[PDB]
């Protein structure tokens, strides 16, 4: 009843997951004892004795028995005490029958067969008994003496079976029971021997599963009921798409069915097999760093050390692959060239050309010209994204191995910082261009010189302070590291730190320096207007005074924000005025 439902359910689960698979009292006491001895010999194999009727209680617990009411009190007591042999045998029979279905997985399957072998020797003892009974040399005292060890062993095994059944344990959960019952019966070889036997037997298939997952780098589960690593969606671009986070259990690890003696190692092991997974996916033959069979160690951890060695092998191989094809150092050099602005000679003509269209709405322009200049160059949450982002002003692409490392979010952050620098630089050389003049009452030379020095200092200090040491330390961390996950942590930390710096050193400034540069560019435009007109001046000087007032106000606000908290190291450079208010 219960067993059939359970096996049906777990077969359906396997199908869903893996898509496949005279009165006795009148008799003299000696005769009564002999009769009951023969009856219990029958009962040992689950067949009835001539004066005992098996109680037909099945599907709730093991088989119990009822003796005839015509029985000696002492003998009835003795048979009562000795009965649990029968129920424990019925329990083990039901257990071995139920593990027949493959839906319990091999691990559970190989479990029961092991006990089946033990059942064998149990029956052997019974045969011994019946031989002694054949000799007529058996007394109930000696029968009990012999069975007492067998009684205890059968009780232990029945408890294990009942625990597995009630917990519906499959895979490592069974192994967890094995892990637990091993400690549950410390202090006796009687139970420890069997616990070690069962641990070895159950772990052998799961050891092999883990060894295939790690050494071969690939899961080969016929049934997925163990801790396992099983998740298969792989969206697009082998879990790349455009924005990518696809290391979040690309194959799912379940902690419910873990054996719970490898958990400390599990975080290492997952990555261990993931690495080989992805070096197969990028395309490269996968070999065993070292081929060996791993066994349960009841007193040591040779599997922990084995997994550590395999993980080191895999990590070093993956590091070589990344520093081989799709080198991260090449990516860093490329980012520094343009994304981190190591080439302004391009930038100069980029700037000469871009504002011919940046003044205009998008989709009303020629994107082609962008790349036409790009190829020229080589000749020489919503508050977490801001609302001042442009639809697009840059373009670069990564490859499958390179995408494995740098996400889209990092590219967006690089693009945002590059947009900030673009703003600063274009303001700078607007001022530079308007500066040119030769040879009085126009004035305002000090205002423009002050604003120019301010923006120059901001650019230099910010860029140096943030990118130089942060980038160099990231380089050193990567060169010192070999854990690909640790590599990703290093890159994420560097990116987050630069994020906490730069223009968003205060994410609630909020872009007051943006207002400063806006008024600055308005001043530059009006100055060019008036110069072109003159090539009244009272209104020109009045506007100069107004713009100086606005600039001073914004400058004071920004100085206050810096002084309150960011960092006044830029303010340290600053000391318009060497002094404060």
Contact present, 180 and 239 (Cβ < 8 Å)? no
Looking from the CA of 149 toward its CB, the CA atoms found within 13 Å total: 9
Which has the closest alpha carbon to 454: 558, 348, 580, 338? 558
Cα(295)–Cα(203) distance, integer angstroms: 7
In the DSSP assignment, the letter for residue 249 is -
Calculated CA dihedral for residues 34, 40, 45, 47, nearest 10 degrees: 90
Q: What's the gap between Cα 510 and its chain centre?
A: 36
Cα(113)–Cα(161) distance, integer angstroms: 13
- Residue 568: other Cβ atoms inside 10 A: 14
Contact present, 233 and 399 (Cβ < 8 Å)? no
Three-class secondary structure of residue 58 per DSSP: coil
Give bridge partners of residue 53 from the DSSP assignment: 66
User: Which contacts of 260-263 are long-range, i.e. CB under 8 A and separated by 24 or more positions?
Assistant: 260/172, 260/175, 260/176, 260/179, 261/175, 261/176, 261/179, 262/210, 262/227, 262/303, 262/304, 262/307
* DSSP string of 368-433, one letter each residue: HHHHHHHHHHTT---TTT-S---S-S------HHHHTTS-HHHHHHHHHHHHHHHHHHHHHHHHHH
Technique used: cryo-EM
- Residue 224: other Cβ atoms inside 10 A: 20
At 562, list the tokens. Answer: 């810096």
Cα(83)–Cα(144) distance, integer angstroms: 11
At 225, list the tokens. Answer: 């009921």
In the DSSP assignment, the letter for residue 52 is E
Three-class secondary structure of residue 183 per DSSP: helix
- Residue 214: other Cβ atoms inside 10 A: 25
Query: Dihedral of CA 230/236/237/240: which sign?
Result: negative
Q: What's the gap between Cα 133 and its chain centre?
A: 63
Calculated CA dihedral for residues 435, 436, 439, 441, nearest 10 degrees: -30
- Residue 463: other Cβ atoms inside 10 A: 16
Three-class secondary structure of residue 285 per DSSP: coil
Q: What's the gap between Cα 410 and its chain centre?
A: 20
Calculated CA dihedral for residues 555, 558, 564, 569, nearest 10 degrees: -80
Which has the closest alpha carbon to 84: 138, 34, 152, 32? 152
Q: What's the gap between Cα 71 and its chain centre?
A: 66
**Phi, psi for residue 64 in degrees, rounded to 5:** -105, 170
Query: Dihedral of CA 461/466/471/472: which sign?
Result: positive
Q: What's the gap between Cα 513 and its chain centre?
A: 41
User: Which contacts of 119-127 are long-range, i.e. CB under 8 A and separated by 24 or more positions?
Assistant: 119/89, 119/92, 119/93, 122/89, 122/150, 122/154, 123/44, 123/45, 125/150, 126/41, 126/44, 126/45
At 64, list the tokens. Answer: 């119990």
Furthest C-alpha separation in the chain: 143
Contact present, 156 and 191 (Cβ < 8 Å)? yes
Calculated CA dihedral for residues 207, 209, 213, 215, nearest 10 degrees: 50
Query: Dihedral of CA 344/346/352/355: which sign?
Result: negative
Give bridge partners of residue 253 from the DSSP assignment: 229
* DSSP string of 540-573, one letter each residue: HHHHHHHHHHHHHHHHHHHHHHHHH----HHHHH
Three-class secondary structure of residue 229 per DSSP: strand
At 453, list the tokens. Answer: 């020095």
Which has the closest alpha carbon to 228: 236, 239, 220? 220
Give bridge partners of residue 33 from the DSSP assignment: none
Cα(509)–Cα(515) distance, integer angstroms: 11
Three-class secondary structure of residue 53 per DSSP: strand
Q: What's the gap between Cα 213 and its chain centre?
A: 16
**Phi, psi for residue 229 in degrees, rounded to 5:** -135, 90
Structure-token match 């673009």, residue found: 422
Contact present, 458 and 570 (Cβ < 8 Å)? yes
* DSSP string of 325-360, one letter each residue: SS-HHHHHHHIIIIITT--HHHHHHHHHHHHHHHTS
């Amino acid at each position: 009843q219960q067993s059939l439902e359970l096996t049906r359910k777990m077969l359906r689960d396997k199908q869903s997951k893996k898509n496949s698979g005279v009165p006795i009292g009148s008799l003299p006491l000696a005769s009564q004892e002999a009769a009951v001895v023969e009856d219990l010999l029958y009962v040992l194999v689950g067949v009835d004795g001539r004066y005992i009727s098996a109680q037909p209680l099945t599907g709730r617990q093991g088989r119990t028995f009822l003796v005839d009411p015509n029985l000696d009190l002492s003998i009835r007591e003795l048979v009562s005490r000795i009965l649990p042999v029968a129920a424990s045998y019925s329990t083990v029979t039901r257990f071995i029958e139920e593990k027949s279905s493959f839906e319990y997985g091999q691990v559970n399957h190989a479990l029961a067969a092991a006990m089946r072998t033990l059942v064998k020797e149990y029956l052997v003892l019974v045969t011994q008994l019946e031989q002694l009974q054949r000799q007529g040399l058996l007394s109930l005292q000696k029968l009990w003496f012999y069975i007492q060890p067998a009684m205890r062993s059968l009780d232990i095994l029945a408890s294990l079976a009942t625990s597995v059944d009630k917990g519906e344990c499959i895979g490592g959960a069974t192994l967890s029971l094995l892990h637990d019952r091993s400690f549950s019966y410390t202090g006796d070889s009687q139970a420890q021997e069997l616990c070690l036997h069962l641990t070895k037997a159950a772990s052998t298939p799961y050891f092999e599963i883990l060894e295939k997952w790690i050494y071969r780098g690939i899961i080969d589960d016929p049934y997925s009921e163990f801790m396992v690593e099983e998740h298969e969606l792989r969206k697009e671009k082998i879990q790349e798409d455009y924005n990518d986070k696809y290391w979040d259990q690309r194959y799912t690890v379940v902690q419910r069915q873990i054996p719970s003696f490898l958990q400390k190692m599990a975080g290492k092991v997952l990555s261990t097999g993931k690495y080989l997974n992805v070096v197969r996916e990028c395309g490269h033959d996968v070999t065993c760093p070292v081929a060996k069979e791993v066994v349960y160690t009841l007193k040591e951890r040779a599997y922990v050390e084995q997994i550590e060695k395999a993980f080191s092998y895999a990590s070093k191989v993956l590091l070589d692959f990344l520093m081989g094809e799709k080198e991260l150092l090449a990516h860093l050099r490329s980012i520094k060239r343009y994304f981190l602005m190591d080439q302004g000679d391009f930038f100069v003509h980029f700037m000469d050309l871009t504002e011919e269209e940046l003044k205009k709405p998008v989709d009303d322009i020629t994107p082609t010209r962008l790349e036409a200049l790009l190829e020229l160059a080589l000749r020489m949450p919503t508050e977490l994204t801001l609302s001042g982002l442009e639809a697009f002003s840059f373009d670069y692409v990564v490859t499958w191995p390179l995408s494995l490392i740098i996400n889209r979010k990092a590219l967006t952050r690089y693009q945002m910082l590059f947009r900030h620098m673009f703003y600063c630089k274009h303001v700078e050389r607007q001022l530079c261009s308007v500066w040119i003049s030769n040879k009085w009452f126009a004035g305002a030379f000090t205002l423009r010189q002050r604003m120019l020095n301010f923006v120059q200092n901001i650019q230099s200090y910010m860029m140096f302070e943030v990118m130089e040491p942060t980038w160099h330390v990231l380089e050193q961390n990567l060169r010192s590291a070999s854990n690909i996950d640790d590599v990703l942590g290093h890159h994420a930390s560097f990116l987050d730190n630069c994020l906490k710096d730069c223009m968003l050193t205060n994410p609630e400034l909020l872009r007051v320096f943006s207002k400063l540069m806006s008024v600055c560019v308005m001043f530059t435009n009006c100055l060019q207007r008036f110069t072109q007109s003159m090539k009244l001046a009272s209104s020109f000087e009045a506007t100069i005074t107004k713009f100086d007032k606005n600039f001073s106000a914004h400058l004071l606000d920004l100085l206050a924000r810096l002084s309150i908290y960011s960092m006044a190291s830029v303010i340290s450079r600053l000391d318009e005025r060497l002094e404060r208010l």
